[PDB]
């Protein structure tokens, strides 16, 4: 249905969106400070492998 408390449901969705935004912002800050898109295997596996091989 479409009935939601808007206190402990709207809050939950807002918190999830805010957490996603903050995580994206932190990853972007890391990528800007480091100068490398790929800082760990999580971000890109094959790309990290090939970049390591090239280095």
């Amino acid at each position: 249905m479409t009935i939601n408390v808007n206190t402990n449901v709207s809050a939950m969705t807002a918190q999830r969106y805010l957490t996603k935004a903050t995580g994206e912002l932190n990853t972007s800050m890391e990528r800007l400070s480091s100068g490398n898109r790929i800082n760990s295997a999580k971000d890109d596996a094959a790309g990290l492998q090939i970049s390591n091989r090239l280095t």
Binding site: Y17, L32, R37
Partner: protein, 54 residues
């Protein structure tokens, strides 16, 4: 020459594209600001609504 080409390829694959990444940072900042503003706006007036009339 091979070293120069290898460095070019490695930069293509790994090095940060600042033009894209600064825009991504600003977009994330704006999104977080909007999220916090909406969280403050809600949960205070509408939540208090179910109580002010009771």
């Amino acid at each position: 020459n091979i070293q120069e080409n290898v460095e070019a390829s490695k930069s293509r694959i790994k090095d940060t594209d600042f033009a894209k990444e600064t825009t991504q940072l600003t977009k994330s900042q704006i999104l977080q600001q909007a999220g916090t503003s909406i969280l403050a706006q809600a949960k205070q007036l509408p939540n208090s609504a179910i109580s002010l009339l009771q």
